[PDB]
Amino acid sequence: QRPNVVFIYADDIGYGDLSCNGAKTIHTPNVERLAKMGVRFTNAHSAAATSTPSRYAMLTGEYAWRKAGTGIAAGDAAAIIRPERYTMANLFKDAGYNTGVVGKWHLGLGDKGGEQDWNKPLQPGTNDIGFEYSFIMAATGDRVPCVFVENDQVINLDPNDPIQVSYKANFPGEPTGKDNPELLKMHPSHGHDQSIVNGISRIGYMKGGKSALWQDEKIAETLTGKAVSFIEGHKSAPFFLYFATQDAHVPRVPSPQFAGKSGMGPRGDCLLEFDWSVGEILNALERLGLDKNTLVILSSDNGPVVDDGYKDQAVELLGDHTPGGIYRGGKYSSFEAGTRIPCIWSWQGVIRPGTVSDALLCQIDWFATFAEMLNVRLPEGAAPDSEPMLKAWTGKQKKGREWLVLQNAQNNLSVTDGRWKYLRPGNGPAYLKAVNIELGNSKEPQLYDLKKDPKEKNNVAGQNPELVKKMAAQLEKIVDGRYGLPL
Numbered sequence: 001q002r003p004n005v006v007f008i009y010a011d012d013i014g015y016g017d018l019s020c021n022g023a024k025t026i027h028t029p030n031v032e033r034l035a036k037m038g039v040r041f042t043n044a045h046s047a048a049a050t051s052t053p054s055r056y057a058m059l060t061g062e063y064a065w066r067k068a069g070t071g072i073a074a075g076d077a078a079a080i081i082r083p084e085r086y087t088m089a090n091l092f093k094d095a096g097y098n099t100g101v102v103g104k105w106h107l108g109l110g111d112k113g114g115e116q117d118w119n120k121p122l123q124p125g126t127n128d129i130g131f132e133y134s135f136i137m138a139a140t141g142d143r144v145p146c147v148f149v150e151n152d153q154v155i156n157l158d159p160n161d162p163i164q165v166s167y168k169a170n171f172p173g174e175p176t177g178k179d180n181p182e183l184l185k186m187h188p189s190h191g192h193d194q195s196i197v198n199g200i201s202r203i204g205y206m207k208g209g210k211s212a213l214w215q216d217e218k219i220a221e222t223l224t225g226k227a228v229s230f231i232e233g234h235k236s237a238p239f240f241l242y243f244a245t246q247d248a249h250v251p252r253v254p255s256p257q258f259a260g261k262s263g264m265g266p267r268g269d270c271l272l273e274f275d276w277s278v279g280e281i282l283n284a285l286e287r288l289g290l291d292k293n294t295l296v297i298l299s300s301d302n303g304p305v306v307d308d309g310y311k312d313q314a315v316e317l318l319g320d321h322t323p324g325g326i327y328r329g330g331k332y333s334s335f336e337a338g339t340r341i342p343c344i345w346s347w348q349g350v351i352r353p354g355t356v357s358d359a360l361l362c363q364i365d366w367f368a369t370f371a372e373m374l375n376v377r378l379p380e381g382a383a384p385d386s387e388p389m390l391k392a393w394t395g396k397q398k399k400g401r402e403w404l405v406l407q408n409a410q411n412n413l414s415v416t417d418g419r420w421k422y423l424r425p426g427n428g429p430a431y432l433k434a435v436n437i438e439l440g441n442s443k444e445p446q447l448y449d450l451k452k453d454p455k456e457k458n459n460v461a462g463q464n465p466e467l468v469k470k471m472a473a474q475l476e477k478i479v480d481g482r483y484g485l486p487l
């Protein structure tokens with residue numbers, strides 16, 4: 001098997017945010033098309049409940065929590081994945097695929113954080129760790145620098161107006177969302193009150209690069225355009241395309257063709273904008289007859305958040321829409337909604353269409369699963385936590401992983417066998433008011449029967465001492481002593 005592999009990888013899109021998992025409160029027709037065209041997963045997880053660790057886990061096949069510095073990265077964060085590492089991109093390139101990444105990166109660029117010259121080539125970047133083509137946002141939509149990077153170079157730079165970036169202090173004379181809120185077309189709810197770009201304040205300060213600044217209205221359009229351009233450009237030979245959307249992540253600034261259309265304000269409108277992007281990819285493959293020999297994978301980097309730092313009506317217009325489906329918590333949390341994400345695999349003539357799998361799966365296993373598919377032996381040390389299971393990911397086998405370690409925003413761990421879930425005691429608040437999410441951090445051990453109690457309402461650690469011991473021990477077995485070590 002040497003098929004094309006296309007990831008459509010969403011940001012902050014929860015189990016109940018797409019209509020494929022049963023929601024009647026939003027209509028995502030293209031995502032339903034994909035589901036009825038392949039296999040839909042009800043128990044597939046991101047490695048982490050935040051972006052940078054989930055993305056690190058996926059491309060490296062290593063649990064993010066094994067390394068300090070794999071947490072939510074700043075725009076000016078240095079390359080977390082160094083060229084010495086064997087990457088999923090490397091696997092494909094070495095197997096003779098063309099490789100491209102389009103959209104959100106959020107794994108750092110350049111050598112030393114806060115010291116990059118954004119007017120010069122970023123070294124090292126995406127093109128040093130197995131990607132032949134890159135068209136990326138440095139970090140998230142709400143983080144400076146708000147420019148696009150093509151093959152590790154910022155595009156549309158006027159050298160008479162060079163970019164500067166600091167997360168330490170403002171450049172004197174540059175206004176902020178905090179001090180100059182009259183310059184804003186969208187107001188912050190918490191943080192997001194530093195440098196201004198197209199009337200929206202961000203996290204971090206910048207100056208110059210006016211010509212290189214993106215427009216948030218046209219991000220979905222620009223990224224999806226480059227994604228389709230890349231599929232059209234490589235229609236003759238095997239390619240791996242990692243298409244990672246801005247969509248559902250703040251600031252939520254959908255194309256005018258989507259403003260108002262969901263009734264749930266910008267947040268809902270950006271789910272429809274995501275569904276549009278999915279449409280563009282599926283149609284490009286169908287136009288070119290690429291649906292004969294293409295594996296399409298749709299998923300999210302982590303669970304959902306309603307208010308994630310802007311006054312964008314997300315709370316007021318949610319109605320009875322449940323982003324996390326029936327599952328407790330959301331983004332940042334130890335609870336299921338933090339990591340249990342929409343996941344579809346579609347592969348014509350391999351995967352039975354309209355199929356469902358309750359297998360315990362994780363995005364960390366794709367690396368090893370693609371080695372199994374390509375029938376190639378992984379180098380010593382590569383994808384160390386990645387468990388191969390092509391049979392499970394193609395819906396031909398009920399049984400997924402036997403054990404899975406999940407991580408939250410405070411880097412506390414949980415372990416599950418698909419049925420029981422043990423949350424290891426750790427530091428951190430029980431609740432974040434700003435984001436209105438239960439984080440699941442506790443000094444007390446927690447045990448939940450996800451089959452009898454999927455809402456994780458009823459902690460039964462006390463009533464199952466022998467089971468708590470078995471699963472505490474199993475967690476540490478998988479941790480080794482390799483937790484929070486240096487990059």
Ligand SMILES: O=S(=O)(O)OC[C@H]1O[C@@H](O)[C@H](O)[C@@H](O)[C@H]1O
Nearest residue numbers: 050051052072140142250308309
């Ligand atoms: O998905 S993530 O990229 O990990 O999100 C990172 C988050 O950091 C937090 O400081 C903000 O409240 C969020 O708005 C978002 O920027």
Ligand SMILES: [Ca+2]
Nearest residue numbers: 011012051301
């Ligand atoms: Ca995210």
